[PDB]
Amino acid sequence: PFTLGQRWISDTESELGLGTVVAVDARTVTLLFPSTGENRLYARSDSPVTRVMFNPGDTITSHDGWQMQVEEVKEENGLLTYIGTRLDTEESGVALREVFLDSKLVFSKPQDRLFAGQIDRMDRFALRYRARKYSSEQFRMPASGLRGQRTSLIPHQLNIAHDVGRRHAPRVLLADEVGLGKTIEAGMILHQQLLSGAAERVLIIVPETLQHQWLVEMLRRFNLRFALFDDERYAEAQHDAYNPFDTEQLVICSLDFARRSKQRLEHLCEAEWDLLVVDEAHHLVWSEDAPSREYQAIEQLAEHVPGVLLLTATPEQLGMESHFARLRLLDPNRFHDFAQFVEEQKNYRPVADAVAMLLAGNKLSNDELNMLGEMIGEQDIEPLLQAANSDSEDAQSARQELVSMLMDRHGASRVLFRNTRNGVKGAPKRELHTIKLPLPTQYQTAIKVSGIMGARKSAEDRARDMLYPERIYQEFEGDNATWWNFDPRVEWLMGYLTSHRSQKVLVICAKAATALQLEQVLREREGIRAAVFHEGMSIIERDRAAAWFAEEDTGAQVLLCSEIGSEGRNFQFASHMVMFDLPFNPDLLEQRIGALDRIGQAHDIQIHVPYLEKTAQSVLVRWYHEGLDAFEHTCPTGATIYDSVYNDLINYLASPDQTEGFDDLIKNCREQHEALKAQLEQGADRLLEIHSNGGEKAQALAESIEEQDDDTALIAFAMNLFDAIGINQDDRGDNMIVLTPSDHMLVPDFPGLSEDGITITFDREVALAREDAQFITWEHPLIRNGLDLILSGDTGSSTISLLKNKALPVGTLLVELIYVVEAQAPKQLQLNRFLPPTPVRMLLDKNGNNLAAQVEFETFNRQLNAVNRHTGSKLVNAVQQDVHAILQLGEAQIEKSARALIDAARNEADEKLSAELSRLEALRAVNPNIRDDELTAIESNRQQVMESLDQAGWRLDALRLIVVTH
Amino acid sequence: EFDAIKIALASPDMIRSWSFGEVKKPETINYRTFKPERDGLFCARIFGPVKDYECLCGKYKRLKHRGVICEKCGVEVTQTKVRRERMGHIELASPTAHIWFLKSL
Amino acid sequence: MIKGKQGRFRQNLLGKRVDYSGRSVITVGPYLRLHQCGLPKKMALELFKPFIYGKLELRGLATTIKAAKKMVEREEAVVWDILDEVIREHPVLLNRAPTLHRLG
Amino acid sequence: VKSDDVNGRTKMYKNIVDGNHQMEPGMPESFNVLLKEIRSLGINIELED
Amino acid sequence: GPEEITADIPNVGEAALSKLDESGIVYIGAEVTGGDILVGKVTPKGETQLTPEEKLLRAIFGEKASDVKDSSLRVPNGVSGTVIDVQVFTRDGVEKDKR
Ligand SMILES: Nc1ncnc2c1ncn2[C@@H]1O[C@H](COP(=O)(O)OP(=O)(O)O)[C@@H](O)[C@H]1O
Ligand SMILES: [Zn+2]
């Protein structure tokens, strides 16, 4: 009966508004929702749509917005046209083609079921209402809930999750130091965006090793998978589709794979993602003189991804300019000149005192008020400042908004994010141990004559060459010379691991050949099994070695990793470390050490380093240990400290005979390091990490979310939903329950189940202990599938319930009405954060009086009990005409309520959009390098979203009859 | 719901009327992924979705866009059991005799 | 596919292992009327099992179905009563081996 | 409904546990399988009234 | 992988494991009944399923403590009995377990 021009409503997707029948085919039909503007190709079979009916005497509105009174309908060629009397002008005989109706539906009321003899049982209404109540809040919950992860709650972790995961097109620099957990936080962001629906298509580019770790971790904890596109997958996706990548949703792809060909980069660019994830962003080689091909490729990616996540473990190893370049990628308007960030930090050195005083509740001197005004470049300051300064009635939130503005002109404290370990509780310990050994004379003979032409190498290059005395010895005495026979290091480490035969150790050297030969020695001589990580090992081999070393129960006793082997693999089980060759530059050794300094350590990390006497190793050890103490501590200030004494340091190293005047240099370096640390802790930072952890207020917020996760309502609701489905449940006892299909399942096959069954636990900590079982939540896919199934299960709603009140008059009728307040717009306008489909509960007696707010649904629910079927429906519907009247009261009593519900999210959108515009304009006025058309466009979008949100409506979704017996 | 049964020689238009689309490529799976190669012998858009209420592209998920032909991968969203009945057809380059009527004996 | 024993023409004729079946050795039954067949307990709690589930969950003795299953497998005294109720009038078909007659 | 019809089997089980004694009128799916088998061959094998 | 005769079985109550031995074999003279496990046997959860992401998992190895389906041999339904003897037979090159 389909025909061109008809208007239909989707059954499951009531949120798209009215759909226009664009075209029909023999077996297919192309519809269009103009309110969403989205075209959908449905199969003619299976009818996933409905033709909502405006009965005669109803009221309709054309797309121009003028209402009418339908009085007749005619059908020709399976196409319906309406005739009615207008309501604005009361002109009769006005005909309308249904194509010219509104694009958004405010109708399809279900009372016709009651007036046509169709009704259901009581167990089809309460579940619907509670599911609606839980689901609507997801789009304005505390970040739709953020408990759907297999993570041990940490303050800054959840603070970052809540902050980033509720922001459109986020772009930040996650630069928490090594091992604190940035993959977990980023997974929180990704899962939050996915659950909210704000993001669906994402990119993830990581180093070669991190791909498998990320994939397995996200699937195991966030239940997220991102397909990996190697050469073969990319090639066959080409050989089928025009655009290979876009078939999938979430992707893993190495930048190595990405930059292979320009057209491949273009294909990646034109895939229209939402979020971009880049791991170890320090590798991005920016240079105003000559940016790298990889760097500009990732720049194109940034240009064509609304969302970006910069994850770097070494924000400052490449000096200050790379950090500024990364921020410029995040915000070119803010970070336009490199010479301004340093002045910003110097100016913010004392400024934390202002916020400290403000948070104390005391008054702020007007002199300091016209310095807070100086920091923030706006002139609307006084209205907010006076309200917050006197601790006005809006102060609880006005102060929060004021400090948000201060952040905004501080740098937002959002493009940057750091977490230390000194003030951040949870660092077990980092003990250091040093061992000195005699330098064998063979390397002395080699190095004495090593310098003939080697002066061509620079001092940096001379130190790099000295990094492998074994390899220079091979070069002098033929390749693969027996260097490992006269090594006191070999004997020392043999004894060390003899002490630790019953324990696992991570040994790390500088290159692949070193790892190969050392493993050869250990396996052939002492029979000690050691899992290597040399570059000759493919990623599969790397995974195999990681697995064998991870089998603490009878696994590899030693993990030999080359320089590249110091990747983000989780070796928290390994609590001991060995530094073989004592790497030259600091931050590489910092990353190596952080390879173990993660969560889940069996005990504190103790590090061992054998160094031969009278060599560059001793100088580097002394300098790092005393001048900066960069080993035991994690003070991130080495970027320019290394540069300052760079030339003298490399001269000393390349000329070990030069030793005069070294202690004073060490002392001055320590003076600089401690002065810089004092400057940083006083201000320009150490409040940024406070924002990252959000303080004890954020801790209490996280605790509230955790208590919400501890809620036991989901367990009962999901268990009874499974029982209705027919899923066999068997409990083991340790908070583990196995669900399996049964002979009496409502569907032959369900998405999230198999014949083998699956174990689940509702507890966070047990799930952490037991990675087997899934962590079931409202965020888990199974519960989402069931919730959507019940919501789309339009069958139900109507009920026949009995209430046993001996002291209430017999025959009293109470109608429970569940309406839905909905708005229509594209997903890319993210109305979820502003207005989702929202339930509205009303309780009407015979005279249409409200009792919903006087008694809650749950306490009411215990009293109800369904009574006999259709005989009951007829007996009670003997007076069903009154229901038609009741609506005219109930609507009249809830329509106003809908208005009260409509008036709310307008502030939510307006305030945040105006704040973002204010920051944009304040930054733009300082820097005349912005396109005014873009801000005109976002102002137009502000008007668009405001006006659209001003449009709304409420529809009826469920109705329940209740009769009180005695 | 079925009165007497009728059997007759099938017209080519009848055969093409017993299909949603035509197969045009002999292929089974990726051998890397589960890729049902386009116009493959198990083509998703000619027969149905490999997994219930899904699109091969993975855009829609398990009930929401039910009975929707994914605009990208061109596949209905219905149960995998729909794959059991959706017939296909191979257009012959040249007319080819049917052996059964040749050798009814 | 249209030929041989697996031919889908002669398929519903070969023989189907029907569910709700049974068997036993036979024993005389005086004290029975002429329309009663003494059926064992151990076989009448595995024939009318789903009927027992229905009349059990409906009565509310164990609303959830898995509880009803675990109750019947627990031989709880109530299940005998429910089974008696369901088999109150629920004719069974007794079929001898070679069914020449139509009385068989 | 007691030999091969999986959908019929499940539906009948639902009706029995739900307290409704009723088969589902409709041609067994074996007919549909045979019909598609014949249609594999160039044979109309259509239905009638 | 091989089939495991360990007493460890998922989706089984403590009642079943009460009479078994640690190895997974019932003790002599155990008055078994219908449904009790005589031998605790399990299989390694089907085969290669899901998607090439599943092959990725196999490359990384799964993350299941159980990682084994239940295939224990129980008493046939409807027979009591008192176990007399339980013989064990081993292929050469298989180290004999506790039972
Ligand atoms: N909340 C948490 N719960 C469990 N494990 C965690 C948590 N946070 C971090 N980890 C562990 O720390 C490891 C390192 O995290 P990742 O962010 O990938 O690298 P890094 O922390 O060094 O940047 C991960 O493998 C993860 O297992
Ligand atoms: Zn699709």
Curated annotation (Swiss-Prot), chain A:
In terms of InterPro entries, this protein maps to:
Helicase_ATP-bd, Helicase_C-like, Helicase_RapA, P-loop_NTPase, RapA_C, SNF2-like_sf, SNF2/RAD54-like_C, SNF2_N
Note whether Transit peptide occurs among the keywords: no
- What does the UniProt keyword field contain? Activator, ATP-binding, DNA-binding, Helicase, Hydrolase, Nucleotide-binding, Transcription, Transcription regulation
- Domain Helicase ATP-binding, by residue range, is 163-333
Which PANTHER family does this UniProt record tie to the protein? DNA ANNEALING HELICASE AND ENDONUCLEASE ZRANB3 FAMILY MEMBER, SWI_SNF-RELATED MATRIX-ASSOCIATED ACTIN-DEPENDENT REGULATOR OF CHROMATIN SUBFAMILY A-LIKE PROTEIN 1
The source's superkingdom equals Bacteria
Keyword Repeat on this protein?
Answer: no
Boundaries of every Helicase C-terminal domain copy: 489-661
Amino-acid positions noted as binding ATP in the UniProt annotation, renumbered to this chain:
D176, E177, V178, G179, L180, G181, K182, T183
An individual GO BP term: regulation of DNA-templated transcription
Gene (name only): rapA
Top class in the EC scheme: hydrolase
Q: What is this protein called?
A: RNA polymerase-associated protein RapA
Source organism per entry reads: Escherichia coli O45:K1 (strain S88 / ExPEC)
Q: Which HAMAP family match?
A: Helicase_RapA
